[PDB]
Amino acid sequence: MTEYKLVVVGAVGVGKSALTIQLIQNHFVDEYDPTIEDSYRKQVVIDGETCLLDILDTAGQEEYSAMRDQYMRTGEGFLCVFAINNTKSFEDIHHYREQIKRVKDSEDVPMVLVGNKCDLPSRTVDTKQAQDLARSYGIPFIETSAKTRQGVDDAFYTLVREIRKHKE
Ligand SMILES: Nc1nc2c(ncn2[C@@H]2O[C@H](COP(=O)(O)OP(=O)(O)O)[C@@H](O)[C@H]2O)c(=O)[nH]1
Numbered sequence: 460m461t462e463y464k465l466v467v468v469g470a471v472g473v474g475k476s477a478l479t480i481q482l483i484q485n486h487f488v489d490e491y492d493p494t495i496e497d498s499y500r501k502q503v504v505i506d507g508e509t510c511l512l513d514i515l516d517t518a519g520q521e522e523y524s525a526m527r528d529q530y531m532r533t534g535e536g537f538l539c540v541f542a543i544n545n546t547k548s549f550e551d552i553h554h555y556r557e558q559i560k561r562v563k564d565s566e567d568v569p570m571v572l573v574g575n576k577c578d579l580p581s582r583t584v585d586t587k588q589a590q591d592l593a594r595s596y597g598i599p600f601i602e603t604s605a606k607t608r609q610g611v612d613d614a615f616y617t618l619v620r621e622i623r624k625h626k627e
């Protein structure tokens with residue numbers, strides 16, 4: 460069976476953990492310690508293909524984790540998450556993409572730009588802004604809400620589709 464190794468990155472508070480838990484466990488977590496980094500696995504069917512997802516929910520801590528290092532080394536695609544009501548988190552995206560490029564020594568890493576918390580009306584990062592930054596990176600942009608579970612499977616599945624392209 461096919462496995463896809465995914466890594467979720469972005470500034471604190473954007474909803475990395477909430478997005479991963481909605482994907483895995485199908486509920487919206489009210490709070491999840493911002494410092495906790497763990498990996499999650501699930502068997503899913505994407506486009507009729509039964510597969511295993513293996514996901515790292517990063518937390519940007521300093522202590523050595525071999526696991527973290529192994530996911531950055533062998534991880535096949537990356538979700539780069541900002542929140543649509545947090546301009547600073549959008550300004551921070553580029554730093555994360557650049558880290559990822561350096562780990563892979565490649566400009567061509569499967570990636571999706573995720574604009575989360577789209578349930579919220581106070582949107583300071585507009586669709587066009589995000590769509591334009593993604594077009595500059597040559598990656599997809601997907602709007603999500605871990606709260607309403609809007610776009611959640613689309614974001615992760617899209618990243619799998621980007622991995623399938625790279626593999627060919
Ligand atoms: N309104 C709303 N709140 C969210 C959404 N995603 C996460 N949050 C909340 O924002 C806070 C930070 O989320 P978290 O997943 O801990 O972010 P992380 O630091 O990126 O892991 C939590 O209290 C979440 O419940 C969402 O899509 N909409």
Ligand SMILES: [Mg+2]
Nearest residue numbers: 475476492493
């Ligand atoms: Mg978290």
